[PDB]
Amino acid sequence: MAEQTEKSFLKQPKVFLSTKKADKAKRPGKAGNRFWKSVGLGFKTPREAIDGTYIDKKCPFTGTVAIRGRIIAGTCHSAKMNRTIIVRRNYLHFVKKYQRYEKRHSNIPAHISPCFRVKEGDHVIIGQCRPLSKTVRFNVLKVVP
């Protein structure tokens, strides 16, 4: 459909689509149903991920990646990549001699599941996963515009 735009047919692992005795209430990812999961740590699975048609191996809610480690919160800084954003963390670093502060920042790449929509400069909550690319080790879980 809209997802099948690449040189190979993209599908979720371990869901048998051409099932014989199908159903609408067995379990997520059983009898042909699209698979989804709840990440945990008090986050809620977006409805657009639940009844979604996108296929994303790296999505927190429908893909194979697990969220574990740190939970950082920041603001979106760049959304000009395919399914990946750069977020800014702004923080205060203490300068001990002068007993004062200075403003520092860090750029964190994070994978953005198609179930979200991000402008530039939205509040994002990202959670850590296994390395997904050279620089990405975090996944977007919440977006507040």
Binding site: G40, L41, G42, R68, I71
Partner: protein, 261 residues
Amino acid sequence: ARGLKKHLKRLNAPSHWMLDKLGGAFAPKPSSGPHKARECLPLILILRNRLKYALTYREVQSILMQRHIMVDGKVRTDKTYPAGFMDIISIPKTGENYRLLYDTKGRFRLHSVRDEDAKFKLCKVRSVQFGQKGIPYLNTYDGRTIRYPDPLIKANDTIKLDLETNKIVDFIKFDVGNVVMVTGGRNTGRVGVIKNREKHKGTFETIHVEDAQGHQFATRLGNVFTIGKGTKPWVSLPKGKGIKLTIIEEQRKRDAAAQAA
């Protein structure tokens, strides 16, 4: 390094072994076993250091090659064997039996027990789950794996294990209201009673404990080890009944004990 390390330099040895810093360049380096080598007490220290049954390295070996020392029911001739918390060390030749328990200062002590209370130990369960062919089995925190447990025993609980029959004989359900002896951190040695448990999704669970003499403290789940059901514990306590005290309390203890002498 291109492989495993086999020496333990004396300054890097655990602080609760109380090894003196000029007594050589190396420390015994506990061999792999049922305890994590930073929370164990090798046989070299049990014989040579604490019990003063031997004066040198080689005397400990002369003791062990003769099959006197028995650890938890089997004879262990390895010299750096990692004996640990709640193990039993038995010398039948002298007919003497010790349970390894903590003292309030965080150091292992050999508490003498009777022969009745040496055929059993307690052990905390690491987890329970299925194995090959659907068989359920539980993990302890000292290596033992038991198959076909009571289907109620869940993780973090305690079990009594007879050394003779090697199976379970009773268990304690980890929960609020039981006595627990702390096995890590600064509070190791202190017994107490579980008063509160607060969960935190994605981090360590923390336990809030209250001593019998009123002092209140806290630790994390991994460092708590239940001893008994209810306020009564199932096993003997050492010279102090697991009650921490301030430095001023023991200063008073020394000076008050200095008037009768």
